[PDB]
């Protein structure tokens, strides 16, 4: 699964994003190269992930 | 809370249930064995 973390619309606009039971390679492996279900790519890139 | 270091109980001891920090998990004596007992399923682990 994939959730949202969020502080609110009104407070904020910074969000994370969690990969259920999947590590921190095979999210890399999302990369925009190969089209996953989530269009969105901008923070594969990650520097804190 | 954190329990003393000092077992002075008027004699009523309480090892078995309390937790034991030789463990990995800091269980009661009984608790582990318990677990021991169970013969779990859906383990919920990280696997692969
Ligand atoms: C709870 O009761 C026991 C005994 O009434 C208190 O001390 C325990 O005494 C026994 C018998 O000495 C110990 O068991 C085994 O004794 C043999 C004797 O050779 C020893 O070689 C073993 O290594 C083992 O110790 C026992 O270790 C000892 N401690 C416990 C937790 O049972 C005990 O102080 C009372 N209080 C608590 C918090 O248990
Ligand atoms: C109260 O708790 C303390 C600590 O467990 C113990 O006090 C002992 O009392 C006797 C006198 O009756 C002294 O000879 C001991 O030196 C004391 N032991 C320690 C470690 O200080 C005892 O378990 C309990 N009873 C009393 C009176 O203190
Ligand atoms: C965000 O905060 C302001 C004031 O703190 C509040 O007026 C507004 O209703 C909030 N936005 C919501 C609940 O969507």
Do not use: M
């Not at chain 2, 800091?26 to 064995?33: G, Q, T, V, Y």
């Amino acid at each position: 699964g994939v959730s949202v973390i969020t502080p609110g619309t009104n407070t904020s606009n910074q969000v994370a994003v969690l990969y259920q039971g999947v590590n921190c390679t095979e999210v890399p492996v999302a990369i925009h190269a190969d089209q996953l279900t989530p269009t969105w790519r901008v923070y594969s890139t990650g520097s804190n992930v | 809370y954190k329990t003393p270091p000092i077992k002075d109980f008027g004699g009523f001891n309480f090892s078995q249930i309390l937790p034991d920090p030789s463990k990995p998990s800091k269980r009661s004596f009984i608790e582990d064995l318990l677990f021991n007992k169970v013969t779990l399923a859906d383990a919920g682990f990280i696997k692969q």
